[PDB]
Scaffold this active site. Structure first.
Site, PDB file in Angstrom:
ATOM      1  N   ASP A  35       5.479   2.433  -8.013  1.00 34.29           N
ATOM      2  CA  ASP A  35       3.832   2.524  -8.279  1.00 34.29           C
ATOM      3  C   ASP A  35       3.353   3.158  -7.036  1.00 34.29           C
ATOM      4  O   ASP A  35       3.087   2.857  -5.824  1.00 34.29           O
ATOM      5  CB  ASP A  35       3.712   1.061  -7.969  1.00 34.29           C
ATOM      6  CG  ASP A  35       2.052   0.662  -8.151  1.00 34.29           C
ATOM      7  OD1 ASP A  35       1.174   1.607  -8.659  1.00 34.29           O
ATOM      8  OD2 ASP A  35       1.799  -0.386  -7.882  1.00 34.29           O
ATOM      9  N   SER A 199     -10.870  15.795  -9.130  1.00 34.71           N
ATOM     10  CA  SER A 199     -10.683  16.567 -10.315  1.00 34.71           C
ATOM     11  C   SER A 199     -11.801  17.418 -10.278  1.00 34.71           C
ATOM     12  O   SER A 199     -12.976  16.920  -9.933  1.00 34.71           O
ATOM     13  CB  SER A 199     -10.272  15.639 -11.392  1.00 34.71           C
ATOM     14  OG  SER A 199     -10.337  16.607 -12.636  1.00 34.71           O
TER      15      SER A 199
END
Length: 330
Positions: A35, A199
């Protein structure tokens, strides 16, 4: 040193991935959910409330000659999906794919919430976010990667998750046969303890690319892709009959649909998520309403590049003095 381990989807939807991890002496092998959105290595154990264990493999520290109680240490964690677990702490030898760390904090669960009990395939979590998020008190503990870093050939790990197929976590090296083209690296903020990056935009299907900054986290422990409501609406508007359902808890679409791809930007590069990766199947057994793999982050407080996005790429988690993320197509 290096390590390399195969990671395997837990079910036919890729809801999560499990990776075998050796703990203790002699080794006890548990299948852990790696994770990158959390920083605790915790396991079902011989200390877990018996009624909360249903098929998981347990760690028994009393059977490990290298286990030592970390005296006074406790842990307690709550995840973004509302699940939780807590317990006490041992140190022990932990190996992943041939890479060994001695003295790793292994957090032994005394209690786990229902979603963990109900998932017999996941024996615990191995956190790979920054150690500043580790919950052990009163002495915060380091992640497996942080402990291994100095010994690694290069201070990196990579995630290569498969679509409906196994993939690989590598530690200490970048397998140049595992991706196509070049790896585009992008800046990371560690201020919230995550692999947080920006992004450069998105496209829906064959549509034109929209240049827009989307701050979010690279999170292997989250199944879906959670993005701003504007972006998510633009995606689902291209799917006939798709709608946001308050009763189901997100966007659903007709199971008869063919989904468009979704592209996200990494610098000037582009990662394309095929439409099929966005199909999470019937909302309930036999339903013709299917659950979408791109959902709004509006109620979270952060955008999350979960498995739906990451599995479309070869992803480098670069733990150099200034960390960065790398993405390549594959």
């Amino acid at each position: 040193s290096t390590g390399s381990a195969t990671t395997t989807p837990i079910d036919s939807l890729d809801d999560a991935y499990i990776t075998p991890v050796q703990i203790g002496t002699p080794a006890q092998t548990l299948n852990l959910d790696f994770d990158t959105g959390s920083s605790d290595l915790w396991v079902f154990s011989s200390e877990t409330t018996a009624s909360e264990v249903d098929g998981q493999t347990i760690y028994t520290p009393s059977k490990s000659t290298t286990a030592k109680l970390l005296s006074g240490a406790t842990w307690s964690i709550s995840y973004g999906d509302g699940s939780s677990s807590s317990g006490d702490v041992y140190t022990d030898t932990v190996s992943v794919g041939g890479l060994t760390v001695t003295g790793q904090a292994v957090e032994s669960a005394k209690k786990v919430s229902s979603s963990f009990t109900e998932d017999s395939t996941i024996d615990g979590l191995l956190g790979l976010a920054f150690s500043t998020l580790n919950t052990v008190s009163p002495t915060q503990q380091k992640t497996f990667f942080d402990n291994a870093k100095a010994s690694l050939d290069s201070p990196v790990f990579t995630a290569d998750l498969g679509y409906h197929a196994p993939g690989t976590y590598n530690f200490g090296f970048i397998d140049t046969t595992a991706y196509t083209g070049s790896i585009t690296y992008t800046a990371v903020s560690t201020k919230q303890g995550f692999w947080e990056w920006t992004s450069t935009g998105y496209a829906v299907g064959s549509g034109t690319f929209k240049s827009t900054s989307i701050d979010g986290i690279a999170d292997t422990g989250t199944t879906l892709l959670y993005l701003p409501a504007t972006v998510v609406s633009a995606y689902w508007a291209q799917v006939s009959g798709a709608k946001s359902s308050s009763s189901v808890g997100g966007y659903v679409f007709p199971c008869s649909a063919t989904l468009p791809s979704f592209t996200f930007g990494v610098g000037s590069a582009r990662i394309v998520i095929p439409g099929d990766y966005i199909d999470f199947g019937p909302i309930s057994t036999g339903s013709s309403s299917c659950f979408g793999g791109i959902q709004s982050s509006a109620g979270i407080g952060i955008n999350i590049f979960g498995d739906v996005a990451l599995k479309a790429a070869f992803v480098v988690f670069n733990g150099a003095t200034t960390p960065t993320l790398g993405f390549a197509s594959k």
